[PDB]
Symmetry: D2
Subunit: 246 residues, 4 copies
């Protein structure tokens, strides 16, 4: 050899054993991306479904992914805490997730965007977080869902004030400053006759991805099915105890 010594400079990044590993992907410069490709405001079904398809491909090509959660230009994957995949090297986790997701995006672009053409290949960033207890993982997922709900409740009335009322962005943002949750709900209900609760459950709750038994003559295989329910309340977790307790 006489050159292998450089490999000694590789630092270790093994994650603490018996701990949940979480990888969060976030699109890079996706505001400009949605701008160049005429994304629908405040929500675009094509983008959300394509993100879910990429997340399913990621869950299928890798292992030990027990749950995924997605929202506009973001996704999170939770690997099981007792995993031994890649000796718990966070670098492998995040690079595999990012590369697989980014390739699947360009691959399945056409399936969901029949009319729109992809102008350029997008970029993504990732990160790894280690959580020692089940409570902290539950709280992280609840944090993501609450962020989803708040952003959707703001953007719905913001684009209702820009599109159906003809206000510049500065005008709408000055109109919404200082409003509470029920305040925005009432602005919607009384100024546009739009009930926020009637909005699609995929816009105000995000997407969850869990293994379930499908059939397709007969194809009794497991696949990552999506859901659009609340993951902050104990009901979801008491209804699926095997995901956490294993």
């Amino acid at each position: 050899s006489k050159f292998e010594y450089v490999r000694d400079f590789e630092a270790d990044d093994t994650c603490l054993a018996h701990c949940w590993v979480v990888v969060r992907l976030d699109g890079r410069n996706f505001h400009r991306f949605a701008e160049k490709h005429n994304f629908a405001k405040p929500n675009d079904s094509r983008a959300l479904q394509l993100m879910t398809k990429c997340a399913q491909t990621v869950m299928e090509e890798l292992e030990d992914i027990v749950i995924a959660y997605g929202q506009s230009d973001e996704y999170s994957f939770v690997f099981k805490r007792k995993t031994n995949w890649f000796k718990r090297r966070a670098s492998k986790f995040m690079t595999h997730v990012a590369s697989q997701f980014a390739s699947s995006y360009v691959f399945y672009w056409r399936d969901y965007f029949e009319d729109q053409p992809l102008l350029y290949p997008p970029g993504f960033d990732g990160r790894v977080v280690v959580y020692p207890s089940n409570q902290t993982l539950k709280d992280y997922l609840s944090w993501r869902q609450a962020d989803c709900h708040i952003n959707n409740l703001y953007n719905t009335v913001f684009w209702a004030l820009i599109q159906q009322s003809g206000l510049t962005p500065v005008q709408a943002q000055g109109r919404l400053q200082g409003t509470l949750a029920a305040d925005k709900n009432e602005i919607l209900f009384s100024e546009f006759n739009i009930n926020y609760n009637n909005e699609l459950p995929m816009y105000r709750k995000g997407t969850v991805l869990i293994w379930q038994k499908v059939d397709e003559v007969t194809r009794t295989r497991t696949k990552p099915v999506p859901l659009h329910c609340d993951i902050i309340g104990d009901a979801f977790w008491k209804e699926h105890p095997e995901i956490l307790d294993e």
Copy 2:
């Protein structure tokens, strides 16, 4: 809020300041990929050029990448040592490189494989390495190029024994066991009349990527772009020819 405290569990991964950062991408299970898509043995020009184009896209979309080096199903990118991009968070470096490369691969698949169809989206893995001195970075690049040369010198005669001689893989591997460099060179030169030195410089030396000044008219308009090369990077001549890459 009531939930943001979970963000405290994010550990720091800042790379040592004043140090070369190197990110190496490597295709995952790429043997099966080259199998399913009828890759040419021992080398396929189309695949190598597609990897080089993805690497150029990576060098253009990101910053402070001063050099890249490529080989069969792998690439390495060297960020300048005094960089401050993303506060030197290795996570950002590697995820950005991996994602950009993997998306550019699927995008530009058609440009080089006009007939061949992509069956599935490929996966890639990455890693970060910190090198404190110019000598260590030079030695890492020399290691990659020497590995390239040895693998190509082996695979050339290995596939020459299977294709042009009709030997099963076990037979070719048993015939090549114990051979040296000159041994394989002589087997090739005397049993197949193939001179290894005349082989394409992109197969036995890899690919290097450096910023150079390109002229493009339609006037003599000019701009900088990442050009490829296939020269030796182990000898000081290459570095004496481009001093701006290390001393900046």
Copy 3:
């Protein structure tokens, strides 16, 4: 300034939040230390108690230490998992523990070694371990106590063959190779009339240090078993806090 930028090269070492931190001190080259100072075989009460006194000083001068466990030439301190001391920088933990222990050793040497003179200042090494659950911390403590018991059971009969039987170390180690627990117990009971079970509780169980009320609270020592659930059911405040 023009020089402060070097401070950027300090790496971060924050321990994972909501996790038990454990610092284990172990004396360096303490074989030669016990050799030059004529330590009692197989155990010396003065030395073990001095280690306990240093550990108490460490528990009092620092914070969030809920328990300590000690044995021949080693000690361990468990900081509470929800601590925020020094922003959970492991470096501060280990350097403070090591320095305080090493200073207290030389300080309180005379109290326990009135006749003996300290020949040189000893050295110590440390380390930090992060445990995510109570079960792993319990298992670590049980590991330490089992190591204590096995080492004491071996050394008792090992020095009994050297002192009361006149055998060289090689002879005793060749005689003890392959013996089980009941094997050593029977060799002791039948060759020296020494019952291992009757041995002092500080030699075959180690030492535990926990806060208790005398009127203010102070770290009292104990010599009971910490592997059995009874110990933890007797002290619920240390685990659930």
Copy 4:
């Protein structure tokens, strides 16, 4: 076994190869320590010399320490960059340095503080820093020496305004607010007739510790020359010092 698996939770602390390792010890709450033991202001020779002796003991009991630098209640040790001691585990470095220093302090307390009694055992904290080039290590040592010089130049005139002038600390600090280097030097030279250059070289330059060859003669008339960590009080910011001792960096 059945319990050793917990050892898997031990994290690694390997230092970057081919890099200078630096351990800096700093006394904990040493303001209160110097207060309770009646330390001399602005500088106390006993404390500084005892710290230097502890640092020498640390340099002798451990290995691969090529240089040490000391200042008020602080010290720094530079291990050789190509070291392999303890497989470059920073924890071992820092814990060994801290424990040895803290024990040597209490041990040799009496040798330098014969009259003063040690009230309690002091505590110390440390840290590890990895430097990739010789320039960064040189700059770190120069940073420490410049900090020493600035603190001593400030404290000299500060305690001259408190002790020989009768000013409260808040008043003296408000009087010193906004003063430059030449300002403090001129206040000292013209209001107290103290020339800063005449001050002891150990106060305005710190302390350096380097291996040098010591000669020594024993009983029975035989002379033996062995290596020992000698102290110095010279400038380490100027290139002259490094040109005079090239073996410390180039090895």
